[PDB]
């Protein structure tokens, strides 16, 4: 199947439009400054909202070298 994603025309922060940046796996779009941390520039790649970046349910890379 085709990954026909959907993007909100309203920011998840203030439900306003304009300069939006939408998540890959989540339809939410945000305003650059409204985000936390706020984007000053558009990221190249699969961008994820705060919830997604916090959704590291799996092992967060155990760096026990000792």
């Amino acid at each position: 199947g085709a990954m026909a994603q959907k993007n909100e025309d309203e920011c998840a922060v203030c439900r306003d439009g304009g300069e939006l940046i939408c998540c890959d796996g989540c339809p939410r779009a945000f305003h650059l400054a409204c985000l936390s941390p706020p984007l000053r520039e558009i990221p190249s790649g699969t961008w994820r909202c705060s919830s997604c970046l916090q959704a590291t349910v799996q092992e967060v890379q155990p760096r026990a070298e000792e």
């Binding site: 994603q5 993007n7 025309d9 309203e10 439900r15 306003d16 439009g17 304009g18 300069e19 939006l20 940046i21 939408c22 998540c23 890959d24 779009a29 984007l39 558009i42 990221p43 190249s44 790649g45 961008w47």
Partner: peptide, 10 residues
């Protein structure tokens, strides 16, 4: 990023 440039609602 899935960037959009819609109309501002304000």
């Amino acid at each position: 990023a899935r960037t959009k440039q819609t109309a501002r609602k304000s």
